[PDB]
Structures are given as structure tokens and as C-alpha cells.
Amino acid sequence: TKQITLYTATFSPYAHRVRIALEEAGAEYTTYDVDILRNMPDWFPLVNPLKKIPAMTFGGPEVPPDQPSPESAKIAESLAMLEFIADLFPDAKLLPTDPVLRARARTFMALYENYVNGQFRDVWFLGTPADPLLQALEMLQGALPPDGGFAAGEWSIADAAVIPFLARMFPYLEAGLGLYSKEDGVKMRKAMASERFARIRQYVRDCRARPSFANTWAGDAEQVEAAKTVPMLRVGEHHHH
Amino acid sequence: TKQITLYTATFSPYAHRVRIALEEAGAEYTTYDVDILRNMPDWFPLVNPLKKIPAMTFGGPEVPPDQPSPESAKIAESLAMLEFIADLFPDAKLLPTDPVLRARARTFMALYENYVNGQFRDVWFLGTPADPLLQALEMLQGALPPDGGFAAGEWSIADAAVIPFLARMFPYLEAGLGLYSKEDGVKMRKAMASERFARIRQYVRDCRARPSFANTWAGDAEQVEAAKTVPMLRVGEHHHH
Numbered sequence A, B: 001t002k003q004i005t006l007y008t009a010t011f012s013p014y015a016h017r018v019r020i021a022l023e024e025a026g027a028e029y030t031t032y033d034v035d036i037l038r039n040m041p042d043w044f045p046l047v048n049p050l051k052k053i054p055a056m057t058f059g060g061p062e063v064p065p066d067q068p069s070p071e072s073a074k075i076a077e078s079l080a081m082l083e084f085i086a087d088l089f090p091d092a093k094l095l096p097t098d099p100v101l102r103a104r105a106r107t108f109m110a111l112y113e114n115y116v117n118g119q120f121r122d123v124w125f126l127g128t129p130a131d132p133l134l135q136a137l138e139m140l141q142g143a144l145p146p147d148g149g150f151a152a153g154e155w156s157i158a159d160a161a162v163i164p165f166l167a168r169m170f171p172y173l174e175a176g177l178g179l180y181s182k183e184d185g186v187k188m189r190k191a192m193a194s195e196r197f198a199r200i201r202q203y204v205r206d207c208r209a210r211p212s213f214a215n216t217w218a219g220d221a222e223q224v225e226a227a228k229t230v231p232m233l234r235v236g237e238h239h240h241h
């Protein structure tokens, strides 16, 4: 009965995680875009004092999203939201029931957050060399079951956590968006098309094929256009050596 | 019934997290120290291919820790281990049952990992400025229940995740450990003794008072001596800004 409102933005992979999870849960919920990076509403710190997207409200009285109520629970951090949605919709099996397989899902999420996401940040926002990122992606790929399936076998929130980032990489590369040089851009594209990364391409296809992805993705070209609005992606700018 | 082996190191706050959780669970477990920073055993990548402490094996046949079995599950990443221990020992109530309180624990852990941990690492091991660490710590304090109590009210794995780092900060500061400037040392010592930080000092006292901390801590002086073995804590080097 308790309402869910997700404050969102199309460019944001962190918001995308939570939308995918709500889709897989079969939840009833509201999304409300926020221009967090250019024109933050002055009421936004009431739903998240960290001034980051996503933000979530839960319960309280039904109110327009730009008039959040003090009675709703204010939930921050995308992975905490993923675990919360799993807790709220236990019959949707957003996590395995078996402890070791659940652990595989939590490990995959931590591998992405601890070793991969910062390399994406380095390469795309600072234009540092791509090799440490390719190395971290090979490590992540290796945590996948090699003969197919999702991170923990069956689909789980761990795949919600990771696919927003991997799904952005390919079209952003094809647009040359990000502070890396053309040389590293070509090197990444060749690498991500090579047999070294066949397994992660299968993984990206399997995740994108689910309705939770189709329903929360603007389309490749539209997502590239939203990403061009991100100040830190510095459209037209590239660093060399 | 299945055996648990935790591969540990006294200096490591990551390994400390998992010991605390295993104490709180009432688990039967083995610990095995690994000189991971100065002399890794050749067999250790068998228990963690990432070559990081902690490492955990679960189930398989009962074997000496330095002869790990192929048959045991290999669980990496300390936060995944905390969730696993909660999953294995539900009667221990290592997380709340209420979904919103569970989200408070997950949020606290993410706030610590995403905004505070890296500041500890960078201030202590790189000597970066202390002000952003103090800001991150004031943010994390603000997430605590104001009147007293642990991150989600009752004790949970969120407190296992955070106390290893907060509890090291104070004796590290007093012993003068880390690559930050004299001026930033004085600054952090005055800050952490000031009224601004009274709530986090009570949190630290409350976590430390539990047997789970007492039985997993070597003592302040002993922990300071272990930290001194860390190569990156190069004695006599300081950075200035």
C-alpha cells in the first residue's frame, strides 16, 4: 500500500539500476526526473541531503513529487534501494534463496563498485589510460558463470546494479563521448568487440533482452544525447597522453 | 554444519568487519592469518584470486587452512561476507526484519563505503587534506539515530562494517601514524575531541563495549604496532598542502 517515488534522470546509471529492479519486482511506483546536475530544485535536499540522484521516498501521504512529505521514509544510495526492493517483494525472487548464491550476487556488486566503476570514472571523466579499465572488466567478466546465465545464475539485483554501466559503454564509445583520446577509444572498441570480451557481450545482450531493460532505456541514440548534457563528460573535449 | 574459514590479518579493518559479524552470529569458525602485504603464500590465490584479505571458504571437506579444498565455496569482499553471515544465521538477527530499518543499515554501509572509506585511505596513505574526511565523517554521524543506538537502531552488520575504521582512527591519531601533515594531525585530533563529534564518539564507545569488538581487537597499542607493518605507512614521510 505504501507509495514508492523514485527521483530519476535519464543519463544516470545509478537511477537506472533502481528502475530495473522496480520493474522486475512488479512494483507500483512513480518516477520524477530531476535536473540534478544543472538546475537542482531547492526542495531536493528534503528527499536527499546528499543532493544525488536517485532519491526515493516510501510511504507517507500521497503528494506531488515536487512537494515531498516529511512523513515518508527518505532512502538514499542505489544499492541500498536494490536490497530494499528485494526485501519488499520477496515473491519476485530478486535475490536467490540459497545463501552461497546470494553471496555470489553481493560479491558481483562489490566487485563492480570497488574495482570497475572508478576505472569508468577515470577513463570517461579524466581521460586516463584505458588498460586498467579493460583489465578490471576482464576480472568482472571472469566472475560470471562462463557457460552462460546471470551473475548469480538466475537474474538478481546484481544484474540491475551492473547493466546500466555496461550498456552505456558501447554507445558512448561509438559516439566518442568521454575525455579519452581517439586512440584509446579505438583500443576500447576493438577490445570490447574481440573474443577476449565475448562473455561480457553475451551478458550485456541477455540483460538488454529483458523487459526491465527495454522499459527503462530511452534507446541508444537518446541515451547518448542525455549523456551529452552531463557537464563532467565535457562534450567536444579529449585529453591526450 | 558447513565449515567457515576466515583468512585474516590483525591490521586489516576489512577482516575485522567479518570477525565481528561471526562473533555476533555465534558461529563456529576458524581464522588463519596471512601476511598478505609482505609475503603472500603461493596457495592464497586459491582462496581469493583477487589476492586480498579477508578471504573466506565455506563448506567442503575439513582441511588445514593452508591446504584449501577445491570443493569449498570461495567468498570474496567483506560486505558480501557480512550479508552472507546474516543469511546463514537468521536466528542471530544480524539485520532488522523491518524493510525500512534494513534499508537504514544498507544505506549506512553505502555512505561509509562511497564517501568516508576513501578519505580515510587517502588521508592516511597519501596524506591528502583532512578537511574532506572530517566533512564525510560529519555526514556519516548525521545518519545515526540522534538519541543513541546503532546505525539501524538495534546492532546490525552495518555497525560491523564501520567500527573497524572508526575505532582505528583514534589510536592511529594518538600514535601519529599516517602520511598527513602535522597541521592536519592536530586539526583531526581537535576535531574528533570537539563537541561537533560527540555523537560519533558515543557510537564508537557503544560498538567497542560489545564482546564482539573486545574479542576481535588486539588492544590499541597492539593494533598500532600491527599498523606499523603496513608498507604504505612509510615512517618519516609526510605530505603538505
Ligand SMILES: N[C@@H](CCC(=O)N[C@@H](CS)C(=O)NCC(=O)O)C(=O)O
Pocket (backbone or CB within 6 Å): A011, A012, A013, A014, A036, A037, A050, A051, A052, A053, A054, A076, A077, A078, A079, B114
Ligand atoms: N552512490 C550513489 C551515487 C549516485 C550518484 O553519484 N549520482 C549522480 C548522477 S549519475 C549525482 O546525482 N551527482 C550529483 C552530486 O554529486 O551531488 C548511489 O549509488 O546512488
Ligand SMILES: N[C@@H](CCC(=O)N[C@@H](CS)C(=O)NCC(=O)O)C(=O)O
Pocket (backbone or CB within 6 Å): A114, B011, B012, B013, B014, B036, B037, B050, B051, B052, B053, B054, B076, B077, B078, B079
Ligand atoms: N573491498 C575489499 C577490500 C579488501 C582490501 O583492500 N584488503 C587489503 C588489506 S586491508 C588487502 O588485502 N590488500 C592486498 C591487495 O590489495 O592485493 C573488502 O571489502 O574485502
Ligand SMILES: O=C(c1ccccc1)c1ccc(O)cc1O
Pocket (backbone or CB within 6 Å): A011, A012, A013, A117, A120, A121, A124, A164, A165, A166, A168, A169, A172
Ligand atoms: O555515466 C557514467 C558512465 C557509464 C558507463 C561508461 C562510462 C560512464 C558514469 C560512470 C561512473 C559514474 O560514477 C557516474 C556516471 O554517470
Ligand SMILES: O=C(c1ccccc1)c1ccc(O)cc1O
Pocket (backbone or CB within 6 Å): B011, B012, B013, B117, B120, B121, B124, B164, B165, B166, B168, B169, B172
Ligand atoms: O587501516 C585503515 C585505516 C583505518 C582508520 C583510519 C585510516 C586508515 C584502512 C583504511 C582504508 C583502507 O582502504 C584500508 C585500510 O587498511
Ligand SMILES: [Ca+2]
Pocket (backbone or CB within 6 Å): B142, B143, B144
Ligand atoms: Ca540526522
